[PDB]
């Protein structure tokens, strides 16, 4: 059996308050749902809630059973607001009307209720002192005096009005400008902070100061004027409370208060030392030193007061000064007071016995700082009548020593301070001397004029490609790599050049450079078809129809003008390569404003058609092998067009990986083909001793990017394991393969035999493919979107190497554009997640901001709600921001969101989307997945423009996103994700989370404003849209 | 205030969410706009309407 | 009307592409083609770097 009687055998007692001038209640009807949910029975009094304007009909409907008066006290758990006193309507002490060895939980204060403690020991009952909850970090749910002080401060700031003579807000009116009134706050605690916040909401000027410097600092951080007296006396004592100061600091503050007494218009005195009398902080003539019409509020009314003249039981106008000396501010606003009392009692009853129904409330004596057993020892003073009244001391406590908690964003400013400007400009100028000796080194090995010209056109194409890839809008990164895989089918240009023979291939050079054309011709058709499919989803139906067929007017005249121009007897190839290069730049410069997206596809098609026509005419084929070129290109394009219109959009990175693998195969098939076709020319030539080094480099890059993207495809489709493979030492292996790769260049030099070149080319292709499989396997599953972009980069640089190899002028421009685009797309997400590229390739751990060990742990309690209250919570919110994750789209649930969003938007709401750039497994992979379902483009906002209106946001929904909405990236310098720029979704009023379970941990779960919907994501979202559709017509 | 037993603005602290109030400004002339400004400064949710 | 926007844009692009072919027809040698290519690419670098 469990050590305690369950809650089903536990009745509770909330009797009527018999004290004078007390309008408070024990538990409201909303408080009766709780603790009947715990299992304890509910017995109510006759008409107690109507004094706080609560219906006893609703109280009996909440689950209670209304009883008598002596029968309300004689239960298993007696609870009141005041202590057990003598009732004048029925003469008896309240301890006699209660059951022996019962339970008592009220504001008792046996330091001032020692005779009441002796009366409570007579019935051998148990006392639960609510006010004796010490200031612990887990005591935020149970602090009776704090909530009472907040209620009294709100009541006092309200009572500022209907006592003053003029308005406190102030305006600039037409008949004249009105000045605001200055308010004084004497005694800085929770009451001073509440009065200051209410006055600043009312538009007043505060000049309150406190003895505790943290109180004055928090008041200044709230916006008040923390004054400073010329007295060197410490205001704090042993902890957060005040202490005893001398008469010198008292006289200095008294002179400052007499000086400020003729300065401000409102004065609120809330200063009191607990256990002793409150110091008189206002003098006899300094109180009259204000204007006629002053307001003097004494919030220390029960404990004397902070004035030299304050009758504590009545209000008075003291010679033109309002003496606000009401004795019970808690009796003034008793409805919200009883609500807060019921909520604090709910947290206390949840903490006292957290089992299902055990009612343990165990007694612990040796207890820690922050331990709930210490709170239980401090709360229970009379244990079954016996005195545990002397509270025990705390355990070994620094008592909040690092109160300046190490927030993350400051340690980087501390790290960027040892970057003293001498070594900053030294590592600046070191880069430029390295670059200039690099270009001198390329000048040293220059064979002729054409190599230097190719270096110049490559360098300027690189700077164009660097400046234009940042130009794309961040909502269109997913068409970007599709159109660069489209343009990277221009290694057919380098395939056609050494293609020949007749209608059949004859040799083996010409055999390789025919399936080079065949596998590269998939890329052109597939890339432009899937780009055209993806740019017909961002187009709104309300957008006026751009007549896209009119772009045949430049294309036909361009290509047919080249056709008429070589029919006329010219050679316009070296300018047609310029034209295709500029149209390929204009393809990526087009998609840069979301409205010129279709221009940047048509220009790409013009450029690829011009490049193919130019390299076709520049060979002058016989009709026997022109048939072979047309047949190879058509048999490539048919497959490339029939596997691009079949795929569903959410499986895009698979064909992105396949289209990198085909380009990687095409480059190695076209490097060794020219090395075979250029072999009897190495004797009487000068550049021939570096077409070998270009062939070796291009074969290496192509052999890497073939196999690495194969492994990335096999890892995206689930077939290979989603766990990294790390059996060996893994660094001797990769360094040995890399050392073999760089060492293979001297046996490929140093002897000109026809076999020793080709076996070394086969060797470097083989070991490079094994290197690619070895590196790309041990990557991960969440680090996937890096290797797509890095493989895109290696494909582009392979095209540029092959362009050096053939001395073709279109290939260097196009390849430098694609490679720079891949590098920029890797850099944007390697700053999105805060890692490096070598911290992902080499399987590293942590991030660029993670310190040493000890990841600090979570605390605080979570809150779950069901479906019916969540949807009504939606219905009273104005602005909604939804932040999806990849688990939304992987469960096919983006479709029922697309109806919810429009039906909420058609009623005046402000539904918008926050997008983190590492949500999907590809750059911007979920912009297209939202835009397929039917959301417009204009309400999908990126991270950097939505991360500043989460303060001005009512409801924040979270669907599936677990890693990009954490606050460990902001508040812990020990966690893995420290420094990762995430959405600041905790800056709002209420948060919902749709997650299938409860609990690798994120402290947005443990906040005052966070729910958790449970269940399948699709099964939750269609229920959401069902409730909206049947609750709004 | 001193007639309504609940707080006017309401906050969500770590002791229970305080729901804000709903104030109806029936009839907006100049005093309607003035009291609406006073309530929106106080923190209430105002839903006033008028025939004009 | 939305016809004339795309019509003007396509007219500008066909004028530019026939101007590129017109520079191609009068080319005497490969040196002039090389200088036209490096001239155009340096022009786009110059356009893109002085908005910065
Ligand atoms: C040969 C390569 C030489 C180094 C290339 C440039 C790297 C340094 C750099 O510019 O870093 C800053 C930038 C990042 O700039 P940032 O981090 O200062 O961000 C500000 C960016 N803007 C101004 C657009 C808002 O680094 C990169 O872009 C990294 C990728 C470089 C890829 C190079 C492609 C062109 C290659 C041509 C050959
Ligand atoms: C045929 C003309 C060249 C091919 C098309 C070039 C093009 O459209 O570039 C668009 C771009 C338009 O880019 P943009 O500068 O208007 O906007 C992109 C940059 N953001 C969004 C960041 C501001 O224009 C150019 O590049 C003009 C360069 C000079 C024009 C002549 C070039 C050849 C000489
Ligand atoms: C080398 C180019 C290889 C192209 C491979 C085929 C992939 C399709 C690209 C061309 C069609 C794009 C498109 O949507 O056209 C239909 C649309 C009309 O819409 P639609 O309703 O006919 O679209 C349906 C088309 N299917 C079924 C194929 C998806 O027309 C345009 O977008 C204008 C024509 C394209 C202009 C740019 C290219 C001009 C030069 C071509 C040579
Ligand atoms: C040279 C690398 C580019 C310049 C650089 O510093 O990049 C930093 C990053 C890594 O450093 P990082 O990711 O810490 O950069 C963040 C820098 N702050 C915080 C100052 C904004 O390098 C890359 O992302 C490499 C991209 C090139 C890929 C080439 C593939 C072939
Ligand atoms: C050699 C030293 C060159 C120093 C100048 C480099 C430069 O253009 O910097 C501008 C920029 C830095 O400017 P930025 O990007 O920092 O300025 C920001 C500008 N906005 C806001 C418009 C984006 O650097 C590059 O573009 C570097 C690209 C790679 C260039 C490398 C050299 C040429 C290619 C290699 C040729 C040989 C193989």
A791 phi and psi, to 5 degrees?
Answer: -70, -35
SS3 (DSSP) at A65: strand
Give the ligand whose atoms come closest to the C-alpha of residue A434. Answer: 5
Distance CA(A486)–CA(A529), nearest Å, equals 9
Hey, what are A766's tokens? 């083989």
Within 8 A of C24 by CB-CB distance, chain A residues are 565, 570, 572, 574-576
Residues with CB under 6 A from ligand 5: A 432, 435-436, 439, 455, 459, 462-463, 466, 470; C 52
Atom of ligand 2 nearest to the CA of C44: 28
Please name the residue that has the structure tokens 């939505």: A946
Cβ burial of A429 (10 Å; 0-12, 13-18, 19+) is exposed
Q: Cβ neighbours of residue A314 under 8 Å, at least 6 residues apart?
A: A325, A326
A953 phi and psi, to 5 degrees?
Answer: -145, 125
Task: Output the CA C10–ligand 3 centroid distance in Å.
Answer: 16
Hey, what are A355's tokens? 């089992």
Please indicate whether, in this complex, the C-beta atoms of A141 and B9 are within 8 angstroms of each other: no
Hey, what are A176's tokens? 């004249």
C45 phi and psi, to 5 degrees?
Answer: -65, -40
Please name the residue that has the structure tokens 């299902």: A356
Please name the residue that has the structure tokens 């204007």: A291
Please indicate whether, in this complex, the C-beta atoms of A1008 and B13 are within 8 angstroms of each other: yes
Identify which of B14, B18, B42 has the shortest CB distance to residue A140.
Answer: B14
Please name the residue that has the structure tokens 């409730």: A1027
Hey, what are A887's tokens? 């688990």
DSSP code for A247: H
**Contact between A832 and A736 (Cβ < 8 Å):** no
Query: For residue A819, which of A832, A841, A835, A803 has the smallest C-alpha distance?
Result: A803
Chains C and B, touching by 3 or more CB pairs within 8 angstroms: no
Chains C and A, touching by 3 or more CB pairs within 8 angstroms: yes
Please name the residue that has the structure tokens 């068409």: A479
Hey, what are A531's tokens? 């780009």
A92 phi and psi, to 5 degrees?
Answer: -170, 145
Dihedral of CA atoms A71, A76, A80, A85 in degrees, nearest 10, equals 70
Cβ burial of A273 (10 Å; 0-12, 13-18, 19+) is middle
SS3 (DSSP) at A905: helix
Distance set, CA A1008 to CA A337, A527, A1005 (Å): 19, 49, 9
Bridge-partner residues for A990, per DSSP? A955
Distance CA(B3)–CA(A25), nearest Å, equals 18
Angstrom resolution of this structure: 3.7
Closest C-alpha residue for ligand 1 atom 36: A462
SS3 (DSSP) at A1029: helix
Query: For residue A106, which of A80, A133, A86 has the smallest C-alpha distance?
Result: A80
Q: Is ligand 1 within 6 A of the CB of residue A823?
A: yes
Q: Cβ neighbours of residue A416 under 8 Å, at least 6 residues apart?
A: none
Name the region of A19 (left: φ>0; alpha: ψ -120 to 50; beta: rest).
beta
DSSP code for B6: S
SS3 (DSSP) at A280: coil
**Contact between A234 and A243 (Cβ < 8 Å):** yes
Hey, what are A588's tokens? 């990526």
Q: What's the number of CA atoms in the CB half-sphere (13 Å) around residue A694?
A: 22
Hey, what are B39's tokens? 């309530």
Distance set, CA A722 to CA A703, A717, A784, A835 (Å): 24, 10, 10, 20
**Separation of CA A724 from chain center:** 27
Within 8 A of B17 by CB-CB distance, chain A residues are 990, 1008-1009
Distance set, CA A527 to CA A489, A586, A616, A641 (Å): 9, 16, 21, 9
**Contact between A810 and A746 (Cβ < 8 Å):** no
**Contact between A367 and A138 (Cβ < 8 Å):** no
**Contact between A488 and A799 (Cβ < 8 Å):** yes
Task: Output the CA A67–ligand 1 centroid distance in Å.
Answer: 78
Cβ burial of A943 (10 Å; 0-12, 13-18, 19+) is buried
Distance set, CA A906 to CA A261, A575, A902, A938 (Å): 56, 55, 6, 16
Distance CA(A565)–CA(A220), nearest Å, equals 79
For an interface test with A, which of B3, B11, B16 has the most A Cβ atoms less than 10 Å from its Cβ? B16
Dihedral of CA atoms A541, A543, A544, A547 in degrees, nearest 10, equals -80
Query: Within 10 A of A606 (CB to CB), how many other CB atoms are there?
Result: 25
Hey, what are A433's tokens? 């001397």
Query: CA of B32, closest CA in chain A: separation in Å?
Result: 16
Angle at Cα A398 formed by Cα A395 and Cα A402, nearest 5°? 150
Distance set, CA A45 to CA A40, A96, A459 (Å): 16, 17, 88
Cβ burial of A313 (10 Å; 0-12, 13-18, 19+) is exposed
Query: What's chain B's Rg over C-alpha atoms?
Result: 13
**Cα dihedral sign, A622-A625-A626-A627:** positive
Query: Within 10 A of A513 (CB to CB), how many other CB atoms are there?
Result: 27
Helix (H) or strand (E) holding A881, with range, is: strand A880-884
Instruction: Please provide the DSSP assignment of A147-216 as one string.
Output: HHHHHHHHHHHHHHTTTSSS-SS--B-SS-B-PPPEEEEES-SHHHHHHHHHHHHHT-EE--B-SSHHHH
**Contact between A30 and A49 (Cβ < 8 Å):** no
Query: What end-to-end distance do the CA atoms of chain A give, in Å?
Result: 54
Q: What's the number of CA atoms in the CB half-sphere (13 Å) around residue A349?
A: 28
Query: CA of A836, closest CA in chain C: separation in Å?
Result: 27
Distance CA(A36)–CA(A64), nearest Å, equals 8
For an interface test with C, which of A568, A582, A815 has the most C Cβ atoms less than 10 Å from its Cβ? A582
Please indicate whether, in this complex, the C-beta atoms of A578 and C40 are within 8 angstroms of each other: yes
Residues with CB under 6 A from ligand 3: A 524-525, 528-529, 532, 548-549, 551-552, 555, 602, 605-606, 608-609, 641
Hey, what are A961's tokens? 């996103």
Closest C-alpha residue for ligand 4 atom 7: A827
**Contact between A636 and A520 (Cβ < 8 Å):** yes
DSSP code for A780: -
Q: Is ligand 4 within 6 A of the CB of residue A831?
A: yes
Query: For residue A105, which of A137, A131, A134, A127 has the smallest C-alpha distance?
Result: A127
Q: Which residue of A has its CA nearest to B5?
A: A333
Distance set, CA A420 to CA A293, A412, A417, A434 (Å): 61, 14, 6, 22
Atom of ligand 4 nearest to the CA of A831: 13
Residues with CB under 6 A from ligand 2: A 471, 582-583, 585-586, 589, 592; C 13, 16-17, 40, 43-44, 47
Per-residue three-class SS string for A628-665: HHHHHHHHHHHHHHHCCCCCCHHHHHHHHHHHHHHHHH
Q: Is ligand 1 within 6 A of the CB of residue A389?
A: no
DSSP code for A43: E
Query: Within 10 A of B8 (CB to CB), how many other CB atoms are there?
Result: 20
The per-residue b/e assignment along A684-708, b for 16 or more CB within 10 angstroms, e otherwise, is eeeeeeebbebbbbbbbbbbbbbbb
DSSP code for A391: P
Hey, what are A571's tokens? 């050679």
Query: What end-to-end distance do the CA atoms of chain C give, in Å?
Result: 34
SS3 (DSSP) at A295: strand
**Contact between A862 and A1012 (Cβ < 8 Å):** yes
Please indicate whether, in this complex, the C-beta atoms of C48 and A464 are within 8 angstroms of each other: yes
Please indicate whether, in this complex, the C-beta atoms of A336 and B18 are within 8 angstroms of each other: yes
Please indicate whether, in this complex, the C-beta atoms of A460 and C23 are within 8 angstroms of each other: no
Packing angle of the helix pair A190-202, A144-160 (nearest 10 deg) = 30
Packing angle of the helix pair A784-806, A449-469 (nearest 10 deg) = 150
Query: For residue A469, which of A850, A846, A923 has the smallest C-alpha distance?
Result: A923
Query: For residue A265, which of A325, A194, A179, A156 has the smallest C-alpha distance?
Result: A179
SS3 (DSSP) at A891: coil
Angle at Cα A24 formed by Cα A68 and Cα A149, nearest 5°? 155
DSSP code for A69: S
Atom of ligand 3 nearest to the CA of A549: 33
Task: Output the CA A167–ligand 5 centroid distance in Å.
Answer: 62
The per-residue b/e assignment along B13-52, b for 16 or more CB within 10 angstroms, e otherwise, is eebbebebbebebeebeeebeeebebbeebbbebeeeeee
Closest C-alpha residue for ligand 5 atom 21: C52
Please indicate whether, in this complex, the C-beta atoms of C17 and A557 are within 8 angstroms of each other: yes
Query: For residue A922, which of A790, A768, A1033, A731 has the smallest C-alpha distance?
Result: A790
**Contact between A297 and A275 (Cβ < 8 Å):** no
Closest C-alpha residue for ligand 1 atom 38: A462
Q: Which residue of A has its CA nearest to B19?
A: A336
Query: For residue A465, which of A819, A861, A57 has the smallest C-alpha distance?
Result: A819
The per-residue b/e assignment along A640-664, b for 16 or more CB within 10 angstroms, e otherwise, is bbebbeeeebbebbebbbbbbbbbb
Query: For residue A329, which of A264, A269, A241 has the smallest C-alpha distance?
Result: A269
Please indicate whether, in this complex, the C-beta atoms of C18 and A551 are within 8 angstroms of each other: no
Distance CA(A516)–CA(B23), nearest Å, equals 75
Distance CA(A439)–CA(A434), nearest Å, equals 9
Atom of ligand 2 nearest to the CA of A592: 21
Distance CA(A814)–CA(A613), nearest Å, equals 16
Distance CA(A460)–CA(C48), nearest Å, equals 12
**Contact between A692 and A552 (Cβ < 8 Å):** no
Closest C-alpha residue for ligand 3 atom 39: A552
Percentages helix, strand, coil for chain B (3-state, rounded to 5) are: 25, 20, 60
Task: Output the CA A584–ligand 5 centroid distance in Å.
Answer: 21
* Binding annotation of B for NAD(+): 30, 50-52
Please name the residue that has the structure tokens 């010219």: A570
Instruction: Please provide the DSSP assignment of A299-352 as one string.
Output: S--TT--SSSS--TTS-EE-SSEEEE--S-STTTSHHHHHHHHHHHHHHHHHHH
Distance CA(A147)–CA(A110), nearest Å, equals 20
Cβ burial of A852 (10 Å; 0-12, 13-18, 19+) is exposed
Within 8 A of C5 by CB-CB distance, chain A residues are 546
Helix (H) or strand (E) holding A626, with range, is: helix A623-642
Distance CA(A157)–CA(A181), nearest Å, equals 13
Helix (H) or strand (E) holding A884, with range, is: strand A880-884
A324 phi and psi, to 5 degrees?
Answer: -80, 90
Identify which of A143, A333, A989 has the shortest CB distance to residue B5.
Answer: A333
Distance CA(A324)–CA(A322), nearest Å, equals 6
For A894-997, where are the E strands, in sequence order? Answer: 912-914, 940-941, 955-959, 990-994
Catalytic residues of A, by residue number, are 963
Q: Is ligand 1 within 6 A of the CB of residue A793?
A: no
Query: For residue B22, which of A643, A813, C13, A876 has the smallest C-alpha distance?
Result: A876
Cβ burial of A231 (10 Å; 0-12, 13-18, 19+) is middle
Please indicate whether, in this complex, the C-beta atoms of A565 and C17 are within 8 angstroms of each other: no
SS3 (DSSP) at A965: coil
Packing angle of the helix pair A449-469, A573-590 (nearest 10 deg) = 20
Identify which of A457, A576, A582 has the shortest CB distance to residue C24.
Answer: A576
Hey, what are A585's tokens? 């730049």
SS3 (DSSP) at A668: helix
Within 8 A of A548 by CB-CB distance, chain C residues are 6
For an interface test with C, which of A468, A572, A605 has the most C Cβ atoms less than 10 Å from its Cβ? A572
Query: What end-to-end distance do the CA atoms of chain B give, in Å?
Result: 29
For chain B, the residues before each gap (C–N > 2.5 Å) are none
Atom of ligand 5 nearest to the CA of A467: 23
Cβ burial of A142 (10 Å; 0-12, 13-18, 19+) is buried
A182-186 β-sheet, strand order: A205-206, A182-186, A266-269, A294-298, A321-324, A316-317
Instruction: Please provide the DSSP assignment of A83-133 as one string.
Output: ---EETTTTEEHHHHSPTT-EEEE---TTT-HHHHHHHTTTT-EEEESTT-
Bridge-partner residues for B45, per DSSP? B22
Query: For residue A609, which of A558, A548, A667, A663 has the smallest C-alpha distance?
Result: A558
Distance set, CA C6 to CA A548, A598, A607, C12 (Å): 8, 11, 19, 10
């Amino acid at each position: 059996v469990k050590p305690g009687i369950p809650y089903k055998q536990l009745t509770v007692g909330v009797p009527k308050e018999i004290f004078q001038n007390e309008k408070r209640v024990a538990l409201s009807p909303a408080g009766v749902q709780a603790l009947v949910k715990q299992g304890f029975n509910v017995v109510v009094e006759s008409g107690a809630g109507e004094a706080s304007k609560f219906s006893d009909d609703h109280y009996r409907a909440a689950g209670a059973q209304i009883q008598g008066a002596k029968e309300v006290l004689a239960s298993d758990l007696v609870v009141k607001v005041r202590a057990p006193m003598l009732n004048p309507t029925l003469g008896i002490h309240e301890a006699d009307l209660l059951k022996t060895s019962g339970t008592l939980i009220s504001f008792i204060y046996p330091a001032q209720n020692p005779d009441l403690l002796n009366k409570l020991s007579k019935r051998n009952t148990t006392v639960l002192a609510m006010d004796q909850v010490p200031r612990v970090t887990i005591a935020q749910g149970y602090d009776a005096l704090s909530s009472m002080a907040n209620i009294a401060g709100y009541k006092a700031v309200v009572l500022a009005a209907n006592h003053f003579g003029r308005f406190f807000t102030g305006q600039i009116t037409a008949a004249g400008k009105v000045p605001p009134a200055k308010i004084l706050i004497v005694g800085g605690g929770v009451a001073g902070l509440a009065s200051a916040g209410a006055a600043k909401s009312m538009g007043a000027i505060v000049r309150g100061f406190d003895t505790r410097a943290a109180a004055l600092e928090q008041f200044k951080s709230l916006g008040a004027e923390p004054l400073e007296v010329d007295l060197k006396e410490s205001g704090e004592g042993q902890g957060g409370y005040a202490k005893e100061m001398s008469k010198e600091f008292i006289e200095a503050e008294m002179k400052l208060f007499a000086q400020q007494c003729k300065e401000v218009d409102i004065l609120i005195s809330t200063a009191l030392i607990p256990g002793k009398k409150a110091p008189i902080l206002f003098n006899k003539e300094m109180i009259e030193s204000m204007k006629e019409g002053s307001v003097v509020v004494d919030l220390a009314a029960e404990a004397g007061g902070n004035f030299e003249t304050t009758k504590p039981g009545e209000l008075y106008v003291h010679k033109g000064i309002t003496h606000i000396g009401y004795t019970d501010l808690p009796s003034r606003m008793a409805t919200q007071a009883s609500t807060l009392y019921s909520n604090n009692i709910t947290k206390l009853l949840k903490a006292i016995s957290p089992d299902k129904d055990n009612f343990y409330f165990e007694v612990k004596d040796d207890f820690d700082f922050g331990t709930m057993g210490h709170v239980i020892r401090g709360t229970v003073v009379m244990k079954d009548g016996q005195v545990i009244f002397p509270a025990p001391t705390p355990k070994n406590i620094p008592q909040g020593a690092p109160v300046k908690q190490k927030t993350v964003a400051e340690l980087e400013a501390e790290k960027a301070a040892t970057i003293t400007p001498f070594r900053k400009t030294m590592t600046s100028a070191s880069v430029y001397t390295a670059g200039l000796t690099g270009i001198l080194g390329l000048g040293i090995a220059a064979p002729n004029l054409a190599f230097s010209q190719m270096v110049t056109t490559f360098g300027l194409a690189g700077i164009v490609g660097y400046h234009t890839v940042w130009g794309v809008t961040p909502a269109l990164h997913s068409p970007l790599m599709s159109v660069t895989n489209a343009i990277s089918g221009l290694t057919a240009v380098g395939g056609l050049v050494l293609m020949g023979g007749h209608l059949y291939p004859s040799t083996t050079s010409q055999g390789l450079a025919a399936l080079a054309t065949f596998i590269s011709s998939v890329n052109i058709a597939g890339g432009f078809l899937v780009t055209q499919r993806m740019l017909d989803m961002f187009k709104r139906p309300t957008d006026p129809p751009e007549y896209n067929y009119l772009y045949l007017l430049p294309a036909g005249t361009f290509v047919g003008g080249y056709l008429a121009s070589l029919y006329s007897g010219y050679n316009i190839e070296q300018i047609m390569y310029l034209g295709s290069g500029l149209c390929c730049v204009g393809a990526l410069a087009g998609l840069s404003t979301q409205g010129t997206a279709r221009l940047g596809n048509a220009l790409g098609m013009i450029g690829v058609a011009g490049g193919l026509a130019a390299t076709l005419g520049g060979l002058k084929p016989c009709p026997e092998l022109l048939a072979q070129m047309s047949g190879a290109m058509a048999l490539g394009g048919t497959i490339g067009l029939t596997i691009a219109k079949r795929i569903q959009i959410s499986d895009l990175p698979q064909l992105v990986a396949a289209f990198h693998s085909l380009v990687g195969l095409a480059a190695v098939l076209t490097c060794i083909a020219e090395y075979i076709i250029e072999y009897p020319h190495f004797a009487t030539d000068a550049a021939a001793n570096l077409t070998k080094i270009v062939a070796y480099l291009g074969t290496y890059i192509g052999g890497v990017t073939f196999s690495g993207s194969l492994v990335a495809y096999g890892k995206l489709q689930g077939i290979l394991k989603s766990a990294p493979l790390l059996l060996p030492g893994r660094h001797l292996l990769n360094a040995g393969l890399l050392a073999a790769s760089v060492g293979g260049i001297i046996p490929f030099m140093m002897d000109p035999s026809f076999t020793t070149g080709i076996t070394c080319l086969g060797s470097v292709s083989a070991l490079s493919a094994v290197m690619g499989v070895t590196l790309t396997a041990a990557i991960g599953g969440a680090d996937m979107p890096v290797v797509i972009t890095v493989l895109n980069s290696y494909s582009g640089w392979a095209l540029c190497a092959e362009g050096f190899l053939l001395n073709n002028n279109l290939l260097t421009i196009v390849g430098a554009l694609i490679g720079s685009s891949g590098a920029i797309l890797s850099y944007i997400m390697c700053v999105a997640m805060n890692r490096s590229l070598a911290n992902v390739i080499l399987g590293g751990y942590g991030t660029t901001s993670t310190a040493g060990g000890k990841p600090m742990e979570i605390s605080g309690t979570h809150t779950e709600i069901n479906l019916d209250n969540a949807i009504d919570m939606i219905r009273e919110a104005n602005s909604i921001i939804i932040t999806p994750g990849y688990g939304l789209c992987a469960a096919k649930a983006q479709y029922p969101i697309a109806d919810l969003v429009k039906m909420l938007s058609e009623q005046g709401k402000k539904v918008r989307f926050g997008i983190h750039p590492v949500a999907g497994r590809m750059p911007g992979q979920l912009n297209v997945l939202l835009a397929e379902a039917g959301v417009p483009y204009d309400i999908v906002l990126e991270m950097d423009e939505i991360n500043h209106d989460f303060p001005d946001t009512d409801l924040v929904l979270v669907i599936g996103a677990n890693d990009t909405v954490n606050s460990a990236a902001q508040e812990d310098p020990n966690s893995i994700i420290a420094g990762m720029p995430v959405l600041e979704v905790w800056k709002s009023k209420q948060v919902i989370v749709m997650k299938r379970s409860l609990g690798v941990d994120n402290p947005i779960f443990y906040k005052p404003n966070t729910a958790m919907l449970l269940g399948d994501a699709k099964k939750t979202c269609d229920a959401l849209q069902a409730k909206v559709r049947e609750s709004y017509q």
